[PDB]
Design a protein around this ligand. Structure first.
Ligand SMILES: NC(=[NH2+])NCCC[C@H](N)C(=O)O
Length: 237
């Protein structure tokens, strides 16, 4: 393995990856990433990036790994490799409480919908909704989405369910918002949970993350770390 593993994360997706008041990285990805590094007996440099720059950065070797609620998708498996699943991640719409909005083309035609640049939600939204005349708006970071949502510049936003809920709906910014309809299940766009994104040729590094991850799951470090943030089964199936 490298002496120092450089891990890219988008620090705008609480409670997975965000900054505290003094600019330190916090959230479940950071705790997963630090624990794994600990067991791998390597050093880990955290690197902040816009989400859409992480895969490009990994391919260019500016970073060695991505831990950024990165969904394991068939599209992304063409370009990069992944650890074993870190946690599940479903997609779900939010709008102003008592919006009639549903994640359907019929509900959203006319409306302004925020999605993260580079995300699965952007892929789903662009193909299903933007083509069909929904005003789908793509943002550098999820904080700009929540801000344009509370500004009234966006009718709704699509992102990871658990990010919206712990990161927005249950924080002071989101008290006037709710989920708009149920989660959107779609195998092709949304992938099979999140993992560490790695260069396809880094077989050793993948082997090292996968070994650390099973180890922390066998001894209950995982549920202990998860209970900090979640009162449910974040790992999923
Ligand atoms: N740290 C972040 N900003 N994560 C964005 C995740 C959105 C979605 N899971 C995807 O893989 O596209």
């Amino acid at each position: 393995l490298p002496q120092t593993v450089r891990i890219g994360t988008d620090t705008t997706y609480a409670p997975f990856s965000s900054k505290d008041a003094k600019g330190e990285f916090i959230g479940f990805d950071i705790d997963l990433g630090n624990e794994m590094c600990k067991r791998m007996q390597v050093k880990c440099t955290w690197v902040a990036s816009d989400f859409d720059a992480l895969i490009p950065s990994l391919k260019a070797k500016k970073i060695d790994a991505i831990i950024s609620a990165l969904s394991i998708t068939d599209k992304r498996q063409q370009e990069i490799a992944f650890s074993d699943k870190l946690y599940a991640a479903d997609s779900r719409l939010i709008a102003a409480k008592g919006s009639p909005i549903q994640p359907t083309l019929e509900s959203l035609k006319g409306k302004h919908v925020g999605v993260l640049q580079g995300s699965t939600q952007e892929a789903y939204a662009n193909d299903n909704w933007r083509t069909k005349g929904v005003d789908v708006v793509a943002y550098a970071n999820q904080d700009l989405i929540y801000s344009d949502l509370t500004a009234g510049r966006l009718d709704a936003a699509l992102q990871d369910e658990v990010a919206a809920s712990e990161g927005f709906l249950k924080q002071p910014a989101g008290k006037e918002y709710a989920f708009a309809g149920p989660s959107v299940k779609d195998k092709k766009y949304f992938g099979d949970g999140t993992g560490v994104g790695l260069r396809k040729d880094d077989t050793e590094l993948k082997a090292a993350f996968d070994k650390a991850l099973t180890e922390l799951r066998q001894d209950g470090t995982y549920d202990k770390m998860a209970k900090k943030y979640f009162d449910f089964n974040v790992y999923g199936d």
